[PDB]
Structures are given as C-alpha cells and as structure tokens.
Amino acid sequence: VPVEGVAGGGTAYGFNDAEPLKQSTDPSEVPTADLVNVWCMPNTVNVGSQETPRALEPINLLAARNERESFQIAMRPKVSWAASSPSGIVQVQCSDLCSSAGDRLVVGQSLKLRRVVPVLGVPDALVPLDLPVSQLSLFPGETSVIWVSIDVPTGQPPGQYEGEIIISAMKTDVVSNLSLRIKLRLTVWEFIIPVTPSLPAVIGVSDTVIEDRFAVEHGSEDWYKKLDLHFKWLLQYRISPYFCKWGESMRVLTYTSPWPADHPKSDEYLSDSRLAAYAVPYRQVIAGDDSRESYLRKEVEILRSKPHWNKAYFYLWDEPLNMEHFDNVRKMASEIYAYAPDSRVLTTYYCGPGDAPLAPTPFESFVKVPNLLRPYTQIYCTSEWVLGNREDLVKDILDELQTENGEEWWTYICLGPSDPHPNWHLGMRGTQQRAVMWRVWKEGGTGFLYWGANCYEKATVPSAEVKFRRGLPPGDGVLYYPGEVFSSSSEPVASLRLERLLSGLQDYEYLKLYESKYGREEAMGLLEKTGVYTGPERYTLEHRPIDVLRGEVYNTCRP
Numbered sequence: 001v002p003v004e005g006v007a008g009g010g011t012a013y014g015f016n017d018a019e020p021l022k023q024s025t026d027p028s029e030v031p032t033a034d035l036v037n038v039w040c041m042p043n044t045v046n047v048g049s050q051e052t053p054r055a056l057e058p059i060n061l062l063a064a065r066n067e068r069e070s071f072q073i074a075m076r077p078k079v080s081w082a083a084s085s086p087s088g089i090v091q092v093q094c095s096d097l098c099s100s101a102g103d104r105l106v107v108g109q110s111l112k113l114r115r116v117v118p119v120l121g122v123p124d125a126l127v128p129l130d131l132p133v134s135q136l137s138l139f140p141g142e143t144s145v146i147w148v149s150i151d152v153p154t155g156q157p158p159g160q161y162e163g164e165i166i167i168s169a170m171k172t173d174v175v176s177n178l179s180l181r182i183k184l185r186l187t188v189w190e191f192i193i194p195v196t197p198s199l200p201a202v203i204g205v206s207d208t209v210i211e212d213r214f215a216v217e218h219g220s221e222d223w224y225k226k227l228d229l230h231f232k233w234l235l236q237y238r239i240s241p242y243f244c245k246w247g248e249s250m251r252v253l254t255y256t257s258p259w260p261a262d263h264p265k266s267d268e269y270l271s272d273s274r275l276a277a278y279a280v281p282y283r284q285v286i287a288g289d290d291s292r293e294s295y296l297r298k299e300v301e302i303l304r305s306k307p308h309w310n311k312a313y314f315y316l317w318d319e320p321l322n323m324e325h326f327d328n329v330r331k332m333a334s335e336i337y338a339y340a341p342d343s344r345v346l347t348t349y350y351c352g353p354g355d356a357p358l359a360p361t362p363f364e365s366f367v368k369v370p371n372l373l374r375p376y377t378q379i380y381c382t383s384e385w386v387l388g389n390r391e392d393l394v395k396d397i398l399d400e401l402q403t404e405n406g407e408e409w410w411t412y413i414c415l416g417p418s419d420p421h422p423n424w425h426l427g428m429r430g431t432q433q434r435a436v437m438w439r440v441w442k443e444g445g446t447g448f449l450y451w452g453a454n455c456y457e458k459a460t461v462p463s464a465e466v467k468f469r470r471g472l473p474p475g476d477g478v479l480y481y482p483g484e485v486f487s488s489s490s491e492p493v494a495s496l497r498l499e500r501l502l503s504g505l506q507d508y509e510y511l512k513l514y515e516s517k518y519g520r521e522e523a524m525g526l527l528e529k530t531g532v533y534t535g536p537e538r539y540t541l542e543h544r545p546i547d548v549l550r551g552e553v554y555n556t557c558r559p
C-alpha cells in the first residue's frame with residue numbers, strides 16, 4: 001500500500017480490502033457467510049461487543065457423563081441485509097447430536113442455547129433462546145454472542161457424537177444452500193463425574209430478597225413454591241444451597257429445607273444425590289407454639305434417624321469478631337450436641353477476637369481460633385483474603401487442626417480477595433473466575449462456602465432493575481438474576497460466573513480422578529506444568545492449557 005493509499009484514498013487506505021463484498025445484500029440470493037462473520041470462541045472468554053472476527057473452524061469438544069460442556073458463537077454483521085432496520089435478523093437452528101451406534105443428545109434436554117447479555121457493560125447474563133429454532137437481531141458494529149451448553153446424562157453411552165447449528169440470514173424452513181453450517185463434534189468418554197459432588201460447595205440464598213422482590217409473605221403457600229423453584233434450579237450447578245436470614249450481630253438462620261423434618265418434602269430435598277450438604281436451622285423457620293429449645297430437640301431427633309444425616313451441618317454465626325460471639329457459638333453448639341453429639345457445626349471467620357487477641361499479631365491470633373472453640377466447631381471455614389498470596393501459610397492453619405478427629409478446613413471468598421486474584425466480581429476475566437476452584441483444589445480444603453447468590457439491593461417487583469449493594473464490588477454476592485428481568489419466564493438466569501463455578505467444579509473432579517490414579521504430587525504437577533494454575537496471582541490467561549489438562553486426564557485415566 002503506497003503513502004497516498006490505493007487509488008489515492010490517503011494514508012493506510014487499502015491495508016486488506018479483506019475480500020471484496022458481493023454487491024447484492026439480498027439474503028435470498030447471497031450466502032449468509034458473505035453477509036455476517038460467524039466464528040466460535042472458548043467458554044473462558046468474556047466476548048465483548050468489539051471482539052474481532054476470526055475464521056470459522058469446526059468445534060471439537062470433550063465431556064464425561066454427568067458433565068456440562070460449553071462453547072460460544074460470535075456473529076458480527078458485514079453489511080445491512082435489512083436496509084431498513086440494520087443490520088438484519090438471523091435464524092438459528094440446532095440439531096440433535098448422534099453417534100455411529102445411533103445414540104442421541106437431544107435439543108432441549110441435553111443441548112441448550114442462551115444469549116450473552118452485558119450487565120454494567122460486562123458480558124454476564126445468559127438468557128434462553130427458543131428451541132430448536134430462534135431468531136436474533138444483529139446491530140451494526142457489534143459482536144453478538146450465544147452460549148451453547150451440552151449436558152451429558154449420567155447414563156449416556158460413550159462415543160463420538162456429531163451435529164450442526166445452522167445460521168440463516170432472513171428477510172423482514174428458511175434453510176438453504178445459502179445457510180451457514182457449524183460443525184459440532186463431541187467425544188463422550190468413560191468417566192462419570194460423581195452424582196454427589198466430591199466437594200461440598202454451600203451457597204447462600206437470601207430469603208428476604210425473595211420475600212421483597214417476588215412479594216411473597218414468609219411462611220405462605222406461594223413462598224414455599226418460590227424457594228422450591230430456586231432450590232431445584234440451583235442443584236444443577238454442583239452446589240448445596242441454603243436459605244439465609246441475618247440476625248442481631250450477624251447470627252444467621254440458615255436452612256436448606258423450609259419444610260419441617262416431618263414432611264415428605266424434607267426427605268425429597270435432603271436425600272437427593274445431587275445435594276452434598278444441608279443446613280439445619282437452630283430456630284424455627286415459620287413461627288410456632290413451641291420454644292426454640294423444644295423445636296430443635298424434635299427436629300434433630302427425626303433427622304439423625306435418616307440415612308442422610310451425615311450431610312447435615314449447622315451454620316450459626318457469620319464472622320464472630322469478638323469474644324462474646326465466640327462464646328455464643330460454644331453455648332449454642334453444646335445446646336445441639338446434647339440432642340446429637342455427632343452434629344457438625346460450621347463457623348466462618350477471618351479473625352480471632354478483636355478485644356482479646358489470642359496472640360501478639362492478627363494472623364497468629366486468627367491461626368489460634370480452633371484452640372479457642374475446640375470441640376464446639378467441626379468445620380473451620382476461613383476467608384481466603386487473609387492469606388494474601390502466601391499459599392505456604394496454609395500449613396500454619398492446618399497445624400492447629402485435628403483431621404483425625406473429624407475437624408475439617410474449608411474456605412470462602414467475598415469482597416476479597418481482589419485483582420488479580422480469583423473471584424467472581426463483575427469485570428474479572430473467565431479464567432480468573434474458573435480459577436477460584438483450581439486454587440481450592442490445590443490448597444486442599446475439604447469444602448467451600450459462598451455467602452450469597454441473589455444478594456441484590458432491595459426491590460419489590462420481579463422485573464425491577466437489578467441494582468447492586470453500596471460498598472461491595474458489583475457481582476460480590478450475586479451469581480444469578482431473576483428470569484423476569486430478561487424475559488417473562490420465572491426460571492432464574494445464570495451468570496457467566498455461575499457457569500465458571502460449575503466448570504471449575506468439573507475440573508476439581510478431573511483433578512481428583514488423576515490424583516486417585518497417580519497420587520497428590522503427580523496431580524499438583526499436572527496443574528502447574530500445563531500452565532493452568534501456578535499461584536493466586538499466576539494462572540492461565542488462555543483456554544488451551546485447560547484442554548491440555550482435561551485431555552491428559554482422558555488419555556491417562558480410562559479403564
């Protein structure tokens with residue numbers, strides 16, 4: 001290209017004409033591909049509206065049984081093919097996928113499509129499209145994206161499955177030689193991801209938020225319907241929900257099942273294979289004629305008789321700060337041990353007592369907390385922020401614990417840690433979201449807690465603007481959104497962060513498989529040598545290393 005440009009257009013005119021466009025913009029005579037750039041992107045990219053076209057290649061995926069695997073489709077108009085509201089509408093159709101043997105993953109149950117919609121200008125909300133045929137408006141100068149997810153049943157036969165997604169520019173069956181065909185190929189392999197998550201990831205759900213936003217009075221018939229809707233939707237993400245009301249001095253009432261332990265709904269919840277752990281409330285959920293002491297005796301007496309009691313825990317206090325709080329936990333714990341001594345009590349903390357340090361510094365007072373509470377807490381759930389990027393001081397935490405007697409170390413994340421550490425704050429990248437669980441795996445805790453998934457600011461209408469709480473990083477405490485904000489459906493809308501939480505929990509399961517066949521040192525070394533995760537401030541920034549790791553697990557760990 002000369003200094004004056006091609007044909008005298010001036011500076012830099014003509015650096016790639018980029019294939020002349022065809023001169024017709026008529027979708028009934030021009031191939032879609034000549035009207036719209038379409039390509040695929042990995043599930044770990046947050047695909048912004050200014051992402052540049054790449055060349056469409058076929059997509060080759062891997063998934064175990066009982067695994068969701070995902071990818072994305074990007075679309076950006078080259079021209080108007082609807083002169084009159086640009087750029088134009090496309091139709092999207094997906095097929096079933098089918099193996100040689102003639103086994104199927106069906107559109108609708110396995111295979112789903114969602115649009116990726118920005119929240120505060122960041123890609124985050126996954127809104128459903130009609131199946132098997134949908135339509136999407138494309139605007140000029142904007143990349144528009146679709147999240148394709150495939151859920152493989154636990155019973156699904158292994159094999160190479162294959163299919164197609166068809167994109168057709170429309171004028172305003174539409175399929176023709178003019179349509180663009182995306183070729184999908186998925187290998188289903190022999191691993192079954194455990195039906196019961198190997199890591200209990202307990203996730204709070206605020207009942208106040210539901211009461212105010214969906215306008216349902218606590219205790220009512222309609223309230224039970226809304227918590228049921230939530231509880232069932234959330235199980236698909238390999239988490240163990242609990243509802244949560246906060247109390248005087250950050251006591252918490254926490255409860256997985258709003259049903260009395262008597263009801264047949266209680267056992268329908270609590271012995272679900274998908275549910276790894278459940279909160280049992282200390283006080284009555286619904287008001288009663290009984291005293292709390294009276295109710296608790298009766299509830300524990302039932303529950304301990306059931307085959308699911310091993311999944312029970314009690315979460316009584318959110319971050320005791322001072323001595324009185326630590327004392328309260330001990331009193332309340334022993335109340336409970338009197339009705340069943342094998343009760344597991346969980347306590348979240350980031351500090352020792354402020355007014356009565358247990359040592360000459362904060363971190364060492366923090367480390368001594370088990371000694372102050374033993375044996376009146378079984379699950380010591382600690383704030384990750386407290387460690388900074390010192391993965392070496394994990395041992396200082398574990399050295400005060402008694403694994404051999406049923407004590408466990410768990411972690412949680414919240415308004416900290418921050419960039420560039422793994423978390424689920426809006427603006428954080430996809431690998432940084434998925435790395436929460438790479439770090440949980442590496443550091444060796446036996447479970448995980450997130451304080452809230454629906455902790456919006458207060459609203460009194462289902463479809464109200466989703467606004468975020470003052471003083472917190474937007475996204476902290478919010479992993480999913482109301483259906484009705486984005487459509488007329490009541491079904492919750494997942495965040496990208498919630499999908500990357502699931503993918504990260506699937507990753508945990510691959511790493512546990514590999515560890516069980518080649519040992520701890522070998523699995524630690526896979527996670528690092530592949531480039532996936534080195535430390536809290538050093539993890540992959542790209543997708544390939546993840547494929548390398550999952551691929552190495554498949555090659556080495558089949559029977």
Ligand SMILES: CC1=N[C@@H]2[C@@H](O)[C@H](O)[C@@H](CO)O[C@@H]2S1
Pocket residue numbers: 318319348412413414415416451472476
């Ligand atoms: C457990 C946790 N206890 C606290 C919560 O009460 C706050 O709402 C949250 C805000 O980030 O931070 C930590 S997480």
